Structure formats: structure tokens, C-alpha cells
Design a protein around this ligand. Structure first.
Ligand SMILES: *[C@@H]1O[C@H](CO)[C@@H](O[C@@H]2O[C@H](CO)[C@@H](O[C@@H]3O[C@H](CO[C@H]4O[C@H](CO)[C@@H](O)[C@H](O)[C@@H]4O)[C@@H](O)[C@H](O[C@H]4O[C@H](CO)[C@@H](O)[C@H](O)[C@@H]4O)[C@@H]3O)[C@H](O)[C@H]2NC(C)=O)[C@H](O)[C@H]1NC(C)=O
Ligand SMILES: *[C@@H]1O[C@H](CO)[C@@H](O[C@@H]2O[C@H](CO)[C@@H](O[C@@H]3O[C@H](CO[C@H]4O[C@H](CO)[C@@H](O)[C@H](O)[C@@H]4O)[C@@H](O)[C@H](O[C@H]4O[C@H](CO)[C@@H](O)[C@H](O)[C@@H]4O)[C@@H]3O)[C@H](O)[C@H]2NC(C)=O)[C@H](O)[C@H]1NC(C)=O
Ligand SMILES: *[C@@H]1O[C@H](CO)[C@@H](O[C@@H]2O[C@H](CO)[C@@H](O[C@@H]3O[C@H](CO[C@H]4O[C@H](CO)[C@@H](O)[C@H](O)[C@@H]4O)[C@@H](O)[C@H](O[C@H]4O[C@H](CO)[C@@H](O)[C@H](O)[C@@H]4O)[C@@H]3O)[C@H](O)[C@H]2NC(C)=O)[C@H](O)[C@H]1NC(C)=O
Ligand SMILES: *[C@@H]1O[C@H](CO[C@@H]2O[C@@H](C)[C@@H](O)[C@@H](O)[C@@H]2O)[C@@H](O[C@@H]2O[C@H](CO)[C@@H](O[C@@H]3O[C@H](CO)[C@@H](O)[C@H](O[C@H]4O[C@H](CO)[C@@H](O)[C@H](O)[C@@H]4O)[C@@H]3O)[C@H](O)[C@H]2NC(C)=O)[C@H](O)[C@H]1NC(C)=O
Ligand SMILES: *[C@@H]1O[C@H](CO)[C@@H](O[C@@H]2O[C@H](CO)[C@@H](O[C@@H]3O[C@H](CO)[C@@H](O)[C@H](O)[C@@H]3O)[C@H](O)[C@H]2NC(C)=O)[C@H](O)[C@H]1NC(C)=O
Ligand SMILES: *[C@@H]1O[C@H](CO)[C@@H](O[C@@H]2O[C@H](CO)[C@@H](O)[C@H](O)[C@H]2NC(C)=O)[C@H](O)[C@H]1NC(C)=O
Ligand SMILES: *[C@@H]1O[C@H](CO)[C@@H](O)[C@H](O)[C@H]1NC(C)=O
Ligand SMILES: *[C@@H]1O[C@H](CO)[C@@H](O)[C@H](O)[C@H]1NC(C)=O
Ligand SMILES: *[C@@H]1O[C@H](CO)[C@@H](O)[C@H](O)[C@H]1NC(C)=O
Lengths: 99, 49, 198, 49, 50
């Protein structure tokens, strides 16, 4: 969940957000069957091109490997893909990469 | 022979990165994080190697 | 009088205080022997940090007839009790008084000068290398980005978990990959300002 | 296999730490592809993988 | 026990804290008279097979 200084609830999680409204402040919500906490890790970089996710929980942004997690099994993706939005779609290509 | 004489210098830098049974290869890193005694022993090992 | 430069990933002021408190008495049992000893981590037996910036604080509460108790620390982890306040970077950090897997042990010893010294307790640290956790000696007030540095002068710098001595300068190079560049000597000569790209 | 004749503008090497400025290396990398989807529309309906 | 290594078992009930149940001690010597097989052999006169 990422927001551009529009945090009705994340402001409670992080009162001193800082910076200004132009940069986007992203957050990871740790949702589970016991708690729904919200964590802050970093601010959105100005440019993002390639994002890689592994089966072992490793996420790579711009060839860095920012964060690592445990075992993964599935994922869900949603945006405004209402048929006619593919022209300005934010995803160019999605592939099943193998080592 | 020209490449043979131009070689045998690059590998001299390599063993600096090698760690000799020490926490890290950077002496400044070790000296400011751990007590003087074991750090001195480890840097003695490093300099001897 | 070396200026100090500290630069990490851009983030706001998220500071927390982790506190270990030890309380014990010596003058009741035998002078050289204790009666009761309690250790609390913010009033709890174990804790785990979550904020990017954290500060450790250790408090002593010892009672004895002599009134003076020598405090000593037995260290096995790569960092000591006070060394953690020297701009240290981690990814996961948890502290407990009980045994935990893949955790080193740090011991605290008290010598009330009565002739015999005793170990109050043992501390266990479960730590992983990383960037999301930073240890600062003091909180930063009115600071939007913790990173601060001085250019074109000799300075003691601590960048991305590596500490060195040198003059730092700006270069007119463009690169879209990586956050730092290293040579075959282990020297991190080139690093990029992620916010600006410089 | 990936076809030849690609600029790979939006591709980067998978690195845990640092990056090679210039040179050559061999390592296991995520390059083998099973299927490719481009100009997409369906993930706007909560696509599941 | 003397000259015995320690093997530890840890249980994490997902409640937030994990504990060590106990410690196991093995006193072992290299040799031939003891063999460890995944399953018993039924109707076998000589365990050797190749
Ligand atoms: C950056 O740092 C990260 C750490 O965060 C490294 O990530 C590790 O990468 C290695 C290499 O892939 C991972 O090791 C893999 O573990 C798999 C899981 O092991 C299970 O299966 C084996 C049997 O194969 C059992 O013996 C074992 O007990 C486990 O049950 C292995 O399966 C992998 O080996 C096999 O993988 C597939 C499976 O079919 C085969 O096709 C392969 O040929 C191979 O035989 C492999 O060993 C490791 O788990 C990762 N760790 C983490 C924490 O994610 C990165 O490697 C490092 N570098 C880079 C560039 O990112
Ligand atoms: C974990 O450990 C930290 C570090 O000790 C604790 O933080 C300290 O908390 C104590 C009180 O429990 C503070 O002592 C007094 O606090 C009063 C109110 O605290 C607020 O204001 C101070 C600044 O004045 C802030 O630092 C603090 O975070 C609160 O926002 C102050 O009014 C007192 O000020 C008096 O002393 C100072 C110094 O002599 C004088 O300048 C003043 O004029 C006044 O006379 C006093 O400071 C202490 O300040 C806190 N230190 C820090 C660094 O925050 C945590 O409470 C503790 N947490 C747990 C769970 O154990
Ligand atoms: C390279 O690395 C440096 C190292 O930190 C980072 O530099 C960022 O960009 C600029 C460069 O200096 C800095 O941020 C900007 O500061 C300006 C001035 O700051 C204050 O100056 C006086 C005090 O001396 C105040 O009175 C004044 O009001 C300023 O607040 C600001 O003008 C910028 O925005 C400010 O004003 C707007 C006006 O609406 C407010 O909305 C903002 O909230 C803000 O108050 C801006 O803040 C700072 O050094 C770094 N900014 C960051 C990290 O956010 C960068 O990492 C990188 N350089 C660049 C350019 O990215
Ligand atoms: C330094 O430590 C002392 C010792 O207290 C305790 O010592 C260990 C046994 C261990 O439990 C420590 O964690 C703990 O600090 C502090 O002195 C007293 O500490 C207690 C905390 O346990 C305070 O509160 C007390 O709590 C008891 C349990 O509920 C309660 O029974 C007490 O009431 C009784 O207090 C005295 C005995 O202490 C007794 O004479 C009374 O008549 C009454 O029944 C009490 O509520 C006390 O308030 C602390 N002070 C006193 C004078 O007892 C000390 O505060 C701490 N810090 C310093 C010295 O700075
Ligand atoms: C990838 O993202 C870019 C950035 O948005 C997309 O470019 C956008 O393309 C659409 C249609 O091609 C443009 O809409 C049309 O623009 C023309 C002017 O060129 C205008 O006359 C029309 O009325 C209509 O608005 C859109 O402007 C353009 N974005 C920008 C910033 O110019 C691109 O299509 C995306 N690619 C994929 C595959 O999704
Ligand atoms: C998750 O663990 C916590 C504590 O063990 C429990 O979650 C509570 O569930 C009740 C009823 O749904 C809520 O009213 C509480 O607010 C929950 N706690 C918290 C901290 O949010 C429960 O045991 C577990 N929940 C599961 C297994 O679904
Ligand atoms: C982010 O900024 C855009 C303007 O480009 C605005 O429309 C949007 O509402 C902002 N985000 C939120 C969560 O308000
Ligand atoms: C970089 O730009 C030009 C060369 O491209 C050079 O003359 C200039 O001095 C440099 N500026 C710096 C290093 O700030
Ligand atoms: C995906 O998000 C849109 C938001 O516009 C929502 O209407 C839709 O129901 C979501 N899809 C699923 C499967 O939740």
C-alpha cells in the first residue's frame, strides 16, 4: 500500500512522515489472522523499471535484492485493468523466469 | 611473452580481500568493533599472511 | 577533530528506546551473596525492535552494604554493549533472557568488593545483517532525512555499513544500476545518491 | 531460449551486493522463460498466480 | 555424558516465543557392529545386496 502523503490510517503508524507530498511513501501491511499491522520500510524511488520476485521470498528492485522473506506459494495482482486501460498499462511484460 | 610480462601483478591485489581466519578483511572495521586484544591478534595474523 | 559523515537510505525520524534494567541486592543475604535479581526489557522478558532507529539503555540498581559494585561484561558477540551505538546497521534484531536458536550469549558480572562476584543473568541476541535497523547514540530532532555529510574535506564517513576515512567528491557520471560500486580491493569508492541520482 | 536481437533496456543483473561496472561472469540467473504476457488486460480482475 | 555431543530440539507454537524441549546426548564410536537402516529387511538371511 503506497500513498502520496494521503494516509488516513498510516499517519497514525508513522506520525513524522516528513518530506513533501510529491514523493510516494510506500508501506507493507502485515495482514494475518491475528493482527493487521502496517510497517514502513522506504520511500518510493523516482524511477522503477524491473521488479523480480523469487519463490524463496527474495524481492529484487533495480538489481539490488532489497528484502528477503520466507517461503512463498501464491500471489494476487489487481489494478485498473478495465480492458481499455492496456494502452497506458503499467506492465509491459510478465514472464515465468527460471534459473 | 608481452602478456606474460604484463601479467603477474593483478593477482597481488586479490589476496588482500582474502580473510585470514578473522571477522573481516578491513582492519579499520575490526579495530572499532571489538576489544583491542583479539583485534590485535587477528591483525597480527593478517599482517603475517 | 575529524568531521563525521553518516549517510544511509533516506527515511524519516522513526526512533525507539530499548531499555534493559537490572535490579539486585547484596547486603541482605551475606554481603558477598545476592538475595534476588530481576532483569526487565521495558518491563518484559523479551523484545524485538521494529523502528528504523533505536537506542539502547542499560540501568543498574544494585544494593550492598559496601555500596560499591564493580560491573564487568563478558562478550562473545562481534559487538559489545556500548559499541552498538556507533551507527550499526542490521535487518532483524531481537533480544531475550532465555535461550534462542542462533543467538550468542553476553554475560554481566557484579563484584560488590565483598570478596566474591556473581553473574546476574545472560543476554541473548538474535541479529541478522541488513539495512532496515540503525543504531544511533542519540535521537535526531527536527530531521526529515537522517543522512548528513560534508563534501570536499577529509572526514570519517560511515556509508551503508562501511566506515572509512577520506575526501568525498561529486562526479558527473550517470548509472542506473546498483547503489554502490566496489573494486577488487574491497574499497567502496563510488556510491549513488538514490534520491537525486548523483 | 531467448531470441537474439534485443537491447535489454529494461533488464538488469541479479545482484545481492555491488555490481560489476564492466566485464564478464558466469552464474545461475533467472533467464529461462515458460510463457510471456504483454499488453495485458486481465490482471485488472484480481488475477491469481 | 562424557565425550558426547548435544542435539537440541526447539518448538515454536507460533504464539511469539519458542522454547527448547530438551537436549539429547549421543556417545558413539566408529566401527562396523552397528548398522542404521531406514527400514527392516524381511525374509533376508544376508543383509548384503548389490
Ligand atoms: C543472495 O542471497 C540469497 C539469500 O537470501 C540467496 O538465496 C539462496 O539461493 C540458493 C540458490 O538457489 C537457495 O538454495 C536453494 O534451496 C532450495 C531449497 O532446498 C530444499 O530442497 C533441497 C533439495 O534440492 C533439500 O535438500 C533442502 O533440504 C530443502 O528442502 C534447493 O532446492 C535448491 O537446490 C535445487 O533447486 C531446484 C529445485 O528443483 C533445482 O532445480 C536446482 O538445480 C537445485 O538442485 C537451492 O539449493 C537458497 O534457499 C536461497 N536462500 C534464501 C534465503 O532464499 C541467493 O543465492 C544470493 N545470491 C543471489 C544472486 O541472489
Ligand atoms: C527507555 O529509556 C529512555 C531513556 O532513558 C526513556 O526516556 C526517558 O524517560 C524519562 C522519563 O521516564 C525522561 O526523564 C524526564 O522526562 C520528562 C518528560 O519526558 C519528555 O520530555 C523529555 C525532554 O524533557 C524527552 O526526552 C522525553 O522523551 C519525553 O518527551 C522531562 O520533562 C524531564 O526533563 C527534566 O530533565 C531534563 C534533563 O535534566 C531537564 O533539561 C528538564 O528541564 C527537566 O528538568 C526528564 O527528561 C528522559 O528525558 C527520557 N529520555 C529520553 C532520551 O527520551 C524511556 O522512557 C524508557 N522507556 C521505557 C519503556 O522504559
Ligand atoms: C542527495 O543527497 C542529499 C543528502 O541529504 C539529499 O538532498 C535532498 O534534497 C534537498 C537538497 O538540499 C534537501 O531537501 C530540500 O530542502 C530544501 C531546503 O530545506 C529547508 O531549508 C531551510 C532551513 O535551512 C528551511 O527554512 C526551508 O523551509 C526548507 O525546509 C527545501 O526547500 C525542500 O522542500 C522543503 O520545502 C517545501 C516547500 O513546500 C516543503 O513542502 C518540504 O516539506 C520541505 O520542507 C527539500 O526538503 C535535502 O538535503 C534532501 N531532501 C530530502 C531527502 O527529502 C537527497 O538524498 C539527494 N538530493 C536530492 C536533490 O534529491
Ligand atoms: C531498585 O530495586 C529495589 C528492589 O525492589 C525489587 O528488588 C528485587 C526483589 C526485584 O523484584 C526488582 O525487580 C525490584 O526492583 C526497589 O525497591 C522497591 O522495589 C519494589 C519493586 O519490587 C517497589 O514496589 C514494591 O512492590 C512489592 C511487590 O508488589 C510490594 O510488596 C512493595 O510493598 C512493600 O514494600 C516494602 C518492601 O520493599 C515493604 O517494607 C512495605 O511495607 C510494602 O509492604 C512495593 O510496593 C518498591 O516501591 C521499591 N521501594 C521500596 C522502598 O520498597 C527500588 O525501587 C529500585 N530502584 C531504585 C533503588 O532506584
Ligand atoms: C506506457 O506508458 C506510457 C505513458 O503513459 C503510455 O503512453 C501513453 O499512450 C497513450 C496512447 O498511446 C496516450 O494517450 C493518447 O495520447 C495522445 C498524444 O500522444 C493524445 O492525442 C490522445 O488523446 C491520447 O490521450 C498517452 O498520452 C501516453 N502517455 C503520455 C504521458 O503521453 C504508453 O501507452 C504505455 N504503454 C503501454 C503498453 O501500456
Ligand atoms: C491470533 O492470535 C491472537 C492472540 O493469540 C488471537 O487473535 C484475537 O482474536 C480475537 C477474536 O477474533 C480478537 O478479538 C482479538 O483482537 C485478536 N487479537 C489481536 C491481538 O488482534 C487469536 O488467538 C488468533 N486468531 C486467529 C487464530 O484467528
Ligand atoms: C496522488 O496524487 C494524484 C495526483 O497526480 C492524486 O490524484 C491522488 O489522489 C493522490 N493519491 C491519493 C491517495 O490521494
Ligand atoms: C562534470 O561535467 C563536465 C564534464 O562532463 C566537467 O567539466 C565538470 O567540471 C564536471 N562537474 C562536476 C564534476 O561537478
Ligand atoms: C480489483 O480492484 C478493483 C478496484 O477498482 C475492484 O473493483 C475489484 O473488485 C478488484 N478485484 C477483486 C477480484 O477483488
Amino acid at each position: 500500500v503506497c500513498s502520496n502523503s494521503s494516509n488516513p490510517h498510516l499517519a497514525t503508524f508513522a506520525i513524522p512522515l516528513g518530506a513533501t507530498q510529491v514523493p510516494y511513501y510506500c508501506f507493507f501491511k502485515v495482514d494475518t489472522y491475528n493482527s493487521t499491522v502496517y510497517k514502513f520500510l522506504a520511500v518510493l524511488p523516482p524511477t522503477v523499471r524491473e521488479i523480480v520476485i523469487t519463490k524463496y521470498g527474495d524481492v529484487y528492485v533495480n538489481g539490488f535484492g532489497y528484502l528477503h522473506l520466507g517461503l512463498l506459494d501464491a500471489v494476487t495482482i489487481n489494478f485498473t485493468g478495465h480492458g481499455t486501460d492496456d494502452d497506458v498499462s503499467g506492465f509491459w511484460t510478465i514472464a515465468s523466469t527460471n534459473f | 611473452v608481452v602478456n606474460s610480462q604484463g601479467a603477474a601483478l593483478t593477482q597481488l591485489t586479490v589476496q588482500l580481500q582474502h580473510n585470514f581466519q578473522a571477522i573481516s578483511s578491513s582492519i579499520d572495521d575490526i579495530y572499532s568493533r571489538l576489544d583491542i586484544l583479539s583485534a590485535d591478534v587477528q591483525v597480527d595474523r593478517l599482517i603475517t599472511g | 577533530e575529524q568531521p563525521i559523515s553518516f549517510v544511509t537510505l533516506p527515511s524519516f525520524n522513526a526512533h525507539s528506546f530499548v531499555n534493559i534494567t537490572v535490579s539486585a541486592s547484596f547486603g541482605g543475604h551475606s554481603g558477598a551473596n545476592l538475595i534476588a535479581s530481576d532483569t526487565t526489557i521495558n518491563g518484559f522478558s523479551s523484545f524485538c525492535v521494529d523502528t528504523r532507529q533505536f537506542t539502547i539503555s542499560l540501568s543498574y540498581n544494585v544494593t550492598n552494604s559496601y555500596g560499591y559494585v564493580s560491573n564487568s561484561q563478558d562478550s562473545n558477540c562481534p559487538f559489545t554493549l556500548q559499541s552498538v551505538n556507533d551507527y550499526l546497521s542490521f535487518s532483524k534484531f531481537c533480544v531475550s533472557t532465555s535461550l534462542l536458536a542462533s543467538a550468542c550469549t553476553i554475560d554481566l558480572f557484579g563484584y560488590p568488593e565483598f570478596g566474591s562476584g556473581v553473574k546476574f543473568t545472560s543476554l541473548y541476541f538474535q541479529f541478522t545483517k541488513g539495512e532496515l535497523i540503525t543504531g544511533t547514540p542519540k535521537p535526531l530532532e527536527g530531521v526529515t532525512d537522517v543522512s548528513f555529510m560534508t563534501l570536499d574535506v577529509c572526514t570519517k564517513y560511515t556509508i551503508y555499513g562501511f566506515k572509512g576515512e577520506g575526501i568525498i567528491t561529486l562526479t558527473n557520471s550517470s548509472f542506473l544500476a546498483g547503489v554502490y560500486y566496489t573494486s577488487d580491493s574491497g574499497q567502496l569508492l563510488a556510491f549513488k545518491n538514490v534520491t537525486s541520482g548523483a | 531460449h531467448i531470441p537474439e536481437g534485443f537491447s535489454f533496456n529494461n533488464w538488469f543483473l541479479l545482484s545481492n551486493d555491488s555490481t560489476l561496472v564492466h566485464g564478464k561472469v558466469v552464474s545461475n540467473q533467472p533467464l529461462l522463460v515458460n510463457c510471456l504476457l504483454a499488453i495485458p488486460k486481465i490482471y485488472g480482475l484480481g488475477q491469481f498466480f
